[PDB]
Design a protein around this ligand. Structure first.
Ligand SMILES: O=C(COc1ccccc1P(=O)(O)O)Nc1cccc(Cl)c1Cl
Ligand SMILES: O=C(COc1ccccc1P(=O)(O)O)Nc1cccc(Cl)c1Cl
Ligand SMILES: [Cl-]
Ligand SMILES: [Cl-]
Ligand SMILES: [Cl-]
Ligand SMILES: [Cl-]
Ligand SMILES: [Mg+2]
Ligand SMILES: [Mg+2]
Ligand SMILES: [Mg+2]
Ligand SMILES: [Mg+2]
Ligand SMILES: [Mg+2]
Ligand SMILES: [Mg+2]
Ligand SMILES: [Mg+2]
Ligand SMILES: [Mg+2]
Ligand SMILES: [Mg+2]
Ligand SMILES: [Mg+2]
Lengths: 228, 228
């Protein structure tokens, strides 16, 4: 439906939608912008991520409420409605994964863009894994793992240890280990090594970069406190 | 789309949607329940009102953000996007007004139901008036006024001055006077008389009814403080 709107108009309206807290509209504007076929700038990548993270975050919160009610009950209505919300969540994840596969990741050559998109691929397979069961669950977990791992490999080679995208990737991959992969030790090791290597590199930063990096380091520390 | 689902299943899912904060789903379930053609119980009327008030409240907040940006700017994008949100808001209001006209109000014979629905009719024409301009604005304002006035007439004849639906009607009609009809004196007079007549009737109430009534009386007092 966004095929007739200018790329720049879609980006302008995504920013308006963010100000209005209209995240479904924001996501649809950014999907239309991606579908124009041009690469995204750093600012535009962040708009894309904010839009979908807010949409899927609402779905995940709803799914958890309904799943909890369903588990306590264990007619068909609670299961039906949890399945409805689950299907819509899966559809959002599949949409984001589709944009990354057609063709954001393959055209992303710079480390900052390529790591950003592979982290997104990890995150959306992670959200699919949260609602998956059984074997099907295994291949989805492995897809998340693989994406995160490729992102980590590039990030370690190409970015300093305080880079916020590198930090955010390591934070989310640590959460994947603790919450999805049943690997709390790997989660704790990753978060601690990431924190310590960032701390050692802070001296190289300006006041503003220091604020950006320490904000995400505090998230790693909050998890380490939750986990130990 | 809800024609195939049982009335009781729609009500059950509206309650699940409320717990999950999925207000658009809640509204669609309650629209389907109304369209079954049976009258609504007190609990079901409240589900209908909560669902739509949350949906339209999100739209009104967005519309205000976009309208403010538009006014400060005074390309077409801000106006286009404000018009999109405005049209969707109007559509929600027209949907609610349609349910009241087909056929909730005409089958509502008891004072508690009839006042509830006429207050809703007042409120949704009020939301249409907030975004209307010009003459068209006049007939919409008069529709809101007329609905509120019929509700007030029944409420004064049929309900005690502490009844929460009577109190809530008077609160919203006072807001209509102050914010829509440019009649701050009528707003203040209504809120003050309503407050005083409720205060005089509190002695007749149980502990729980007293809590219900004084909660809404505090809203009247908060407005009187804002307005004087
Ligand atoms: O509360 C959280 C915390 O999740 C973190 C924390 C650190 C890094 C990444 C995430 P997330 O990508 O949101 O799972 N996420 C969240 C956000 C919205 C809805 C729901 Cl149900 C959840 Cl769990
Ligand atoms: O902040 C309010 C206060 O509105 C009142 C106050 C007392 C009675 C009735 C109402 P309302 O029916 O929400 O206009 N409402 C509101 C609720 C959601 C979005 C927006 Cl923009 C608004 Cl203005
Ligand atoms: Cl359902
Ligand atoms: Cl490339
Ligand atoms: Cl638009
Ligand atoms: Cl009747
Ligand atoms: Mg063009
Ligand atoms: Mg049942
Ligand atoms: Mg399923
Ligand atoms: Mg490239
Ligand atoms: Mg580099
Ligand atoms: Mg039936
Ligand atoms: Mg422009
Ligand atoms: Mg218009
Ligand atoms: Mg009747
Ligand atoms: Mg009576």
């Amino acid at each position: 439906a966004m095929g007739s709107m200018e790329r720049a108009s879609l980006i302008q309206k995504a920013k308006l939608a963010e100000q209005a807290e209209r995240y479904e509209d924001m996501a649809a504007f950014m999907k239309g912008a991606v579908e124009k076929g041009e690469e995204l700038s750093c600012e535009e990548r962040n708009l894309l991520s904010v839009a979908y993270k807010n949409v899927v975050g609402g779905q995940r919160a709803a799914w958890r409420v309904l799943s909890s009610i369903e588990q306590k009950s264990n007619g068909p209505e609670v299961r039906e409605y949890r399945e409805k919300v689950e299907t819509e969540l899966q559809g959002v994840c599949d949409t984001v994964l589709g944009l990354l596969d057609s063709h954001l990741i393959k055209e992303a050559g710079d480390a900052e863009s390529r790591v950003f998109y592979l982290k997104m691929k990890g995150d959306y397979y992670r959200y699919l894994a949260e609602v998956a069961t059984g074997d099907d669950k295994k291949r989805i977990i492995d897809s998340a793992r693989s994406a995160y791992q490729e992102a980590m490999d590039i990030s370690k080679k190409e970015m300093p240890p305080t880079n916020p995208i590198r930090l955010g990737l390591a934070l989310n991959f640590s959460v994947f280990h603790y919450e999805i992969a049943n690997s709390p030790e790997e989660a704790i090791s990753l978060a601690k090594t990431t924190f310590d290597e960032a701390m050692a590199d802070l001296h190289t930063l300006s006041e503003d970069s220091y604020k950006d990096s320490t904000l995400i380091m505090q998230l790693l520390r909050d998890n380490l406190t939750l986990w130990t």
